[PDB]
Design an enzyme around this catalytic site. Structure first.
Site, PDB file in Angstrom:
ATOM      1  N   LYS C 164      72.118  22.295  64.970  1.00  0.00           N
ATOM      2  CA  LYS C 164      73.584  22.484  64.274  1.00  0.00           C
ATOM      3  C   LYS C 164      74.556  23.523  64.990  1.00  0.00           C
ATOM      4  O   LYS C 164      73.598  24.373  65.633  1.00  0.00           O
ATOM      5  CB  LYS C 164      72.965  22.331  63.255  1.00  0.00           C
ATOM      6  CG  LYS C 164      71.532  20.946  62.523  1.00  0.00           C
ATOM      7  CD  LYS C 164      72.469  20.096  62.819  1.00  0.00           C
ATOM      8  CE  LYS C 164      71.642  18.625  61.538  1.00  0.00           C
ATOM      9  NZ  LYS C 164      71.647  17.756  61.955  1.00  0.00           N
ATOM     10  N   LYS C 190      64.995  17.940  68.513  1.00  0.00           N
ATOM     11  CA  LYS C 190      65.858  16.672  68.398  1.00  0.00           C
ATOM     12  C   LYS C 190      66.947  16.756  69.118  1.00  0.00           C
ATOM     13  O   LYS C 190      67.837  17.773  68.605  1.00  0.00           O
ATOM     14  CB  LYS C 190      65.169  15.942  67.411  1.00  0.00           C
ATOM     15  CG  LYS C 190      66.398  15.226  66.531  1.00  0.00           C
ATOM     16  CD  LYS C 190      65.908  13.417  65.799  1.00  0.00           C
ATOM     17  CE  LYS C 190      66.822  12.718  66.106  1.00  0.00           C
ATOM     18  NZ  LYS C 190      67.862  12.567  64.886  1.00  0.00           N
ATOM     19  N   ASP C 192      71.168  14.587  67.662  1.00  0.00           N
ATOM     20  CA  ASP C 192      71.764  14.079  67.334  1.00  0.00           C
ATOM     21  C   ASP C 192      71.758  12.795  67.272  1.00  0.00           C
ATOM     22  O   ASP C 192      72.259  12.947  68.774  1.00  0.00           O
ATOM     23  CB  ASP C 192      72.825  14.816  66.119  1.00  0.00           C
ATOM     24  CG  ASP C 192      73.074  15.988  65.801  1.00  0.00           C
ATOM     25  OD1 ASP C 192      72.055  16.089  64.710  1.00  0.00           O
ATOM     26  OD2 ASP C 192      73.026  16.977  66.401  1.00  0.00           O
ATOM     27  N   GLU C 193      71.971  11.582  66.677  1.00  0.00           N
ATOM     28  CA  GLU C 193      72.766  10.293  66.415  1.00  0.00           C
ATOM     29  C   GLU C 193      73.452  10.074  67.495  1.00  0.00           C
ATOM     30  O   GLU C 193      73.680   9.640  68.229  1.00  0.00           O
ATOM     31  CB  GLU C 193      71.819   9.176  65.596  1.00  0.00           C
ATOM     32  CG  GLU C 193      73.242   9.469  64.559  1.00  0.00           C
ATOM     33  CD  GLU C 193      72.979  11.079  63.229  1.00  0.00           C
ATOM     34  OE1 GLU C 193      71.769  11.209  63.182  1.00  0.00           O
ATOM     35  OE2 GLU C 193      74.062  11.470  62.607  1.00  0.00           O
ATOM     36  N   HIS C 283      65.578   6.251  66.116  1.00  0.00           N
ATOM     37  CA  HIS C 283      66.427   6.498  64.431  1.00  0.00           C
ATOM     38  C   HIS C 283      67.356   5.468  64.233  1.00  0.00           C
ATOM     39  O   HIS C 283      67.226   4.544  64.871  1.00  0.00           O
ATOM     40  CB  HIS C 283      67.503   7.140  65.499  1.00  0.00           C
ATOM     41  CG  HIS C 283      68.500   8.257  64.660  1.00  0.00           C
ATOM     42  ND1 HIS C 283      68.776   7.683  63.711  1.00  0.00           N
ATOM     43  CD2 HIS C 283      68.685   9.460  63.615  1.00  0.00           C
ATOM     44  CE1 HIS C 283      69.654   8.632  63.109  1.00  0.00           C
ATOM     45  NE2 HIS C 283      68.532   9.802  62.851  1.00  0.00           N
ATOM     46  N   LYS C 323      68.405  14.634  50.708  1.00  0.00           N
ATOM     47  CA  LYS C 323      70.038  15.029  50.037  1.00  0.00           C
ATOM     48  C   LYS C 323      69.992  13.179  50.563  1.00  0.00           C
ATOM     49  O   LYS C 323      71.783  12.853  50.112  1.00  0.00           O
ATOM     50  CB  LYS C 323      70.567  15.057  51.310  1.00  0.00           C
ATOM     51  CG  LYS C 323      70.180  14.557  53.022  1.00  0.00           C
ATOM     52  CD  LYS C 323      71.609  15.998  53.718  1.00  0.00           C
ATOM     53  CE  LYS C 323      71.028  15.226  55.245  1.00  0.00           C
ATOM     54  NZ  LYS C 323      72.729  16.277  56.126  1.00  0.00           N
TER      55      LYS C 323
HETATM   56  O1  LIG Z   1      72.339  13.611  60.867  1.00  0.00           O
HETATM   57  C1  LIG Z   1      71.306  14.147  59.483  1.00  0.00           C
HETATM   58  O2  LIG Z   1      71.343  14.067  58.215  1.00  0.00           O
HETATM   59  C2  LIG Z   1      69.630  14.398  59.875  1.00  0.00           C
HETATM   60  O3  LIG Z   1      69.563  14.837  61.173  1.00  0.00           O
HETATM   61  C3  LIG Z   1      69.098  15.281  58.765  1.00  0.00           C
HETATM   62  O4  LIG Z   1      69.525  16.753  59.008  1.00  0.00           O
HETATM   63  P1  LIG Z   1      69.226  17.678  58.851  1.00  0.00           P
HETATM   64  O5  LIG Z   1      67.700  18.080  59.120  1.00  0.00           O
HETATM   65  O6  LIG Z   1      70.231  19.303  59.287  1.00  0.00           O
HETATM   66  O7  LIG Z   1      69.614  17.567  56.980  1.00  0.00           O
HETATM   67  C4  LIG Z   1      68.826  13.128  59.924  1.00  0.00           C
HETATM   68  O8  LIG Z   1      69.508  12.510  61.301  1.00  0.00           O
HETATM   69  C5  LIG Z   1      69.167  11.732  59.362  1.00  0.00           C
HETATM   70  O9  LIG Z   1      68.473  12.666  57.990  1.00  0.00           O
HETATM   71  C6  LIG Z   1      68.809  10.771  59.098  1.00  0.00           C
HETATM   72  O10 LIG Z   1      68.364   9.794  57.965  1.00  0.00           O
HETATM   73  P2  LIG Z   1      67.465   9.020  58.079  1.00  0.00           P
HETATM   74  O11 LIG Z   1      65.969  10.676  57.821  1.00  0.00           O
HETATM   75  O12 LIG Z   1      67.130   8.733  56.661  1.00  0.00           O
HETATM   76  O13 LIG Z   1      67.235   8.282  58.643  1.00  0.00           O
HETATM   77 MG   LIG Z   2      71.683  14.485  63.603  1.00  0.00          MG
END
Ligand SMILES: O=C(O)[C@@](O)(COP(=O)(O)O)[C@H](O)[C@H](O)COP(=O)(O)O
Ligand SMILES: [Mg+2]
Ligand SMILES: O=C(O)[C@@](O)(COP(=O)(O)O)[C@H](O)[C@H](O)COP(=O)(O)O
Ligand SMILES: O=C(O)[C@@](O)(COP(=O)(O)O)[C@H](O)[C@H](O)COP(=O)(O)O
Ligand SMILES: [Mg+2]
Ligand SMILES: [Mg+2]
Lengths: 464, 108, 464, 108, 95, 95, 95, 95
Positions: C164, C190, C192-193, C283, C323
């Site tokens: 982040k 990891k 981010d998507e 993802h 969240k």
């Molecule tokens: O972008 C985000 O919000 C996260 O990196 C969480 O960040 P934090 O760990 O900093 O909160 C994940 O990609 C989500 O959890 C994906 O959702 P799911 O797991 O439901 O697919």
């Molecule tokens: Mg992310």
């Protein structure tokens, strides 16, 4: 200074004073927050989580310039006659998106803001692409104007047919049905969205016999004929392999399902279509899973916009009157958005942003889904000239066969185009033009008597 | 039940009964009312493969009445009886042909 | 004999007397019809339009054997405490689908049955795959058992981190943050998507600096370290090009977004990963657009089954507490469906059909989304041992930095694993183990004090 | 603030304070109560690249009590003082190791 | 003299491989000291294993559509002698 | 991949399927050919062979062409064979 | 199906330019794979030693094995387990 | 219309390459149709200089290949704006 803890989303993400730049991506969200959550916090959370957002403050934020790259909400507009419902406007800087990638612009904005605990429902209504971002994309391989030059067809909408039943027919029987349709007077024939390479009929057999059916029909009538061959395949290699064989048989047009196969595969094929000079028809299978409900999902106008950038010569828009859902005010909105170069902002029509395309070619609209000979004058007036009208059951379901059924549609279309050019209203004299043309043609007279009673009239879920 | 007879077709408006001189005049009137440029084209043989036809004189940029267009068709018809003749309409803004229809077929 | 006209859908599509075969694809639909429409007609229309259906009777149906290829509705079950709401059970013959293609099975069933005028809402709850159909697919490239053997890690759940902020950081500053997380005690890091190849940091630069960060951290700690490199790209050529460079740098693992890129692109990559021995992280971006609402869309358990057949070693299952939205009964339903070999039918859990996998490898569960040190004993008890727990904000948001932040999470996990093996309930003594471990480690004592008050508690929209 | 010291780690349970003989007995008891087969492995050097350790005798297929496993660890320790020693647990149904932890490090 | 019926699990065989199913079953059970003779009479393939194979490249129904020959059995001929003729002489006999 | 028909010659079959006490019966070798791939297969001539051996020939010929074959001990078939829409192979009668 | 007692016979028949394989012979040892492999290696090295020295391996075969089992504990256990296990049947293929 | 009247060659302008309003592959196809018609009508060899000047060396050779595919006698290039390295590459290809 660095302060560790939990920061409010409203503090540095909601800025009403900000004015949108010309090189900026803008989105319009319809938000429904959970009871006890403010309007500003809900709008800030969508703006934050989509771009540079995290639940707790991180130290690495200070190394980068956070103020330059963050997405911000600039305006909140409440929905009339609705409690806890508002329209959020979010700006996104141009520099954070990848060039020529629909996958990136989709994964960034609508990635994980949906399925947030703080809001019960979310809907992306409309998106705005700047001129600077549009220029990175290829767009359609050919477009409306180039297509009509290659096909040598002017003055009227194009006619098509879908082979029925969807599954069961042999490769030899499939080609026989293709030939009988094109002989009658239709421009194109089409494979169903589910036909790929089943145990009962293999793809390479279907491709061979259809090519023989066109060759006979073209030489007989003296007009250019085609058939959309379904190229949709399990892998990217198998997809390109089927397209190559269609090129080898000298076929003008192929089809693909963009949503089920994905945008990565669709971008690959559209680039290939440009290099080899092949026209590309696009089926919108699995669209209604996303765009049906008025409270949740992504509206089709966004999915239409994304397809134009990715590539495609034809697109299904859906019939206003027919077996599947459609709204005249909404439909005419995104249909004029795919065909025109410049579209003005219209709130009643459903268009939230002024969209400007930089000399990018238009995409031909396809009206298909449970339409017969009586719906002809209504379709011609709504969709205009630059469109394709397709009749699956309307062609084959004729009591005399495919060839008289294909003549029945062709007579009905050309009689309406003639009447329009003379100076007659198709909304007032629509029944009269069809009835007077059915006096000198026996094929039209039989088809009129059969589907007179049939009308699809139901309430639409998606409304303005 | 009836079987459809085999017949050669000529694109737009070829399925309707043959056009009268009144009907052609109405189609030309449509082109001029919109603001498009009318033109006359002729060819020896009609084929799906060929996409260029020989241009008769030049496109009529200064056309005031639909009678002027019909006069140019009559001139091409008397000069070439054994040729196909069509009327085309050019658009300058979109840069694409709006209308195309065959008015004369080779006589016998 | 041939009869032309309009036939009622109820007549030859709804058969209650039919008993499903073992080599048959079964689907459960939650149907909501328009007022004035019978339960049988609504159920028959979904069964018809998905497979070999048309709005009018056609002559070409008599050439094929219609009774062999048609999909039929065999059982109608009404939903308790609901008016005009029912479960419909539809059986599809094995021969009409393509071998080893998720694209075809998705385009066939959920093609255009949604968006019908005769019904307001439709939802696919569960899908059954027969043993004979499963054998055509490749499945996951490695599976749970082979993955642990290659990584050499046994006994505990795995730990990960997401860098982040999502966007803004340079290639060099990215690698520095990657290094500090892996040095502390985390197994994976990891991307981010939404990170692909932006103007501020290009992919090839990121790939190089991350590789240097792993090498230094592996040699320092003495453990095997890794990082998921985002391979997601605009085209199929660019996607395979990025994967080749990761193979060139001797990288154990790469990641991909399957829904935004599509099933066609994902199946291409899953075959590549098998042929090169590279692990594949998946993802689930853009999932909550489809699986949020209880009245419309496709439930995630269908998408989880579709991914296991397509290919993937890890899958995001979502945190129960966090969240983003998640329900304990529903989550444990599809979690035990992705890992186990044989799953019994359970209506209260949400599973409609008995699923059997023919020795096909299991997919590892990934829990992520706003979790800190206090949620540790809850996640370990629910998800079990064969899971990955990822802390984005939780690691980097530590007051002392990434290296003490990673050591705090590592101590907390290994304290929970040790307490479980002795014979102590983590539901009853969850707070006790975390508090007693914070006495001998200063890093955990700081982390506990910061995120004590923070709790995500909201009402879920998707319910049984 | 404090800077994290550089330390060489040994996979599972390495971050917790060094395990007592009572704590090892409880971890081995967990293996037997589930129904897994306990085995002793030894190696000269501990490296992340290498994934095979030399097996001590055979896996204990017929173990009744956790005392019998601890007796095998003591015999390997007395024989090899300068070798790393770890205890593993084989599952026969899933065909994958369940637990792996180091009991001995080379003495000085 | 007796018939022995033996069952084999599906998971031990390779997908789409006749070579494996032949090497596994009829590998080295023949040529055993305990039995003078052995003969395999029949084999059963389950549906799940059949779906892995491609099968025939066209089949009966597709072949007749490609050749345009319906109603009757097809007629063939083998050129004699087997070994001796020239390439030019072979083609004349074919014609 | 190229759309070419494939004819299969059963040369060297008699080394394996001749003796009633040892080897592999031709019906097993015919089943393997349908799975591996082939549009035509040689089945052998029916002229004499008494009445009993004629039934065996019609056993494996039906087993190559039909979609579903019922169990029949007198014919020679030991198991009920079910093909999942897999195309049939055309029989060659020659000799 | 060969073990430590067949070692002096195998050296005599096949000579030097040959490979000898033990499937169940190596993995069937009471102590494991490593002591099982050492038992097989020690037995072979002793048979080569006696052959080069000028001793008949057909008559003094059991003597060389017993002498080698004296200084090797791994071989001494292997000789105790397999000693009565001998395959003796009539051969079908003969001169 | 120019080639019909009695000119030997026609030419693309130096600034025509592949603009948004008309793409290069479209221009190549329609001009090829015009040459074919005019040649057959007059009975003399007709040609058109197709502009092959491109942003990259790969894009240049790609455009040249398609001109050969349409059986075109002549192509054109700008040697000073594209450079001497690009021109020598094309000259060797043309030979
Ligand atoms: O972008 C985000 O919000 C996260 O990196 C969480 O960040 P934090 O760990 O900093 O909160 C994940 O990609 C989500 O959890 C994906 O959702 P799911 O797991 O439901 O697919
Ligand atoms: Mg992310
Ligand atoms: O499968 C079908 O339902 C159709 O073939 C219509 O069949 P008929 O022509 O026989 O009615 C079309 O694919 C739909 O119109 C697609 O919907 P849309 O255009 O809304 O994407
Ligand atoms: O499968 C088996 O039986 C073997 O692995 C031996 O194992 P054991 O040593 O454990 O018996 C061999 O493949 C056969 O002996 C080969 O036969 P041949 O020498 O006739 O080729
Ligand atoms: Mg269809
Ligand atoms: Mg010039």
């Amino acid at each position: 200074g660095y302060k560790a803890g939990v920061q409010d989303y409203r503090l540095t993400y909601y800025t009403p004073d900000y004015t949108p730049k010309d090189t900026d991506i803008l989105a319009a969200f319809r938000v429904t927050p959970q009871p006890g959550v403010p309007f500003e916090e809900a709008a800030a959370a969508v703006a934050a989580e989509s771009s540079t957002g995290t639940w707790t403050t991180v130290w690495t934020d200070l190394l980068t310039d956070l103020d330059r790259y963050k997405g911000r909400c600039y305006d909140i507009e409440p929905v009339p006659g609705e409690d806890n419902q508002f329209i959020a406007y979010i700006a996104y800087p141009l520099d954070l998106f990848e060039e020529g990638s629909i996958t990136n612009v989709l994964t960034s904005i609508v990635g994980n803001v949906f399925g947030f605990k703080a809001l019960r429902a979310l809907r992306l209504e409309d998106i705005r692409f700047p001129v600077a971002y549009i220029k990175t994309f290829q767009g359609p391989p050919h477009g409306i104007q180039v297509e009509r030059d290659k096909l040598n067809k002017y003055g009227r909408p194009l006619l098509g047919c879908t082979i029925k039943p969807k599954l069961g027919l042999s490769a030899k029987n499939y080609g026989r049905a293709v030939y009988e349709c094109l002989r009658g007077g239709l421009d194109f024939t089409k494979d169903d969205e589910n036909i790929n390479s089943a145990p009962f009929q293999r793809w390479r057999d279907r491709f061979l016999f259809v090519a023989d059916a066109i060759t006979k029909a073209q030489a007989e009538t003296g007009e250019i004929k085609g058939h959309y061959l379904n190229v949709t395949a399990p892998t990217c290699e198998e997809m390109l392999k089927r397209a190559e064989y269609a090129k080898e048989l000298k076929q003008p047009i192929i089809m693909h399902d963009y949503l089920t196969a994905g945008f990565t595969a669709n971008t690959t094929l559209a680039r290939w279509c440009r290099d080899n000079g092949v026209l590309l028809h696009i089926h919108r299978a699995m669209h209604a899973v996303i765009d049906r409900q008025k409270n949740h999902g992504i509206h089709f106008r966004v999915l239409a916009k994304a397809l134009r950038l990715s590539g495609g010569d034809h697109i299904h828009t859906g019939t206003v009157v027919g077996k599947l859902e459609g709204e005249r005010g909404i439909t005419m909105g995104f249909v004029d958005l795919l065909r025109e170069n410049y579209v003005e902002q219209d709130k009643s029509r459903g268009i939230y942003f002024t969209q400007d395309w930089a000399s990018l070619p238009g995409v031909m609209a396809v009206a298909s889904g449970g339409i017969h000979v009586w719906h002809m004058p209504a379709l011609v007036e709504i969709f205009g000239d630059d469109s394709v009208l397709q009749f699956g059951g309307g062609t084959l379901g004729h009591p005399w066969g495919n060839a008289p059924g294909a003549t029945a549609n062709r007579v009905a279309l050309e009689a309406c185009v003639q009447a329009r050019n003379e100076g007659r209203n198709l909304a007032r004299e629509g029944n009269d033009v069809i009835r007077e043309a059915a006096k000198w043609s026996p094929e039209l007279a039989v088809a009129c008597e059969l589907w007179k009673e049939i009308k699809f009239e139901f309430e639409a879920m998606d409304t303005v | 039940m009836q079987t459809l007879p085999k017949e050669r077709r000529y694109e737009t408006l070829s399925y309707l009964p043959p056009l009268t001189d009144v009907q052609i005049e109405k189609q030309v009137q449509y082109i001029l009312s919109q603001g498009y440029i009318p033109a006359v084209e002729f060819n020896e043989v009609s084929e799906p493969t060929e996409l260029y036809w020989t241009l008769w004189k030049l496109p009529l940029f200064g056309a005031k009445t639909s009678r002027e267009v019909l006069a140019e068709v009559q001139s091409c018809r008397s000069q070439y009886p054994g040729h196909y003749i069509r009327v085309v309409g050019f658009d300058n803004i979109k840069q694409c042909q709006i209308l195309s229809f065959i008015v004369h077929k080779p006589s016998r």
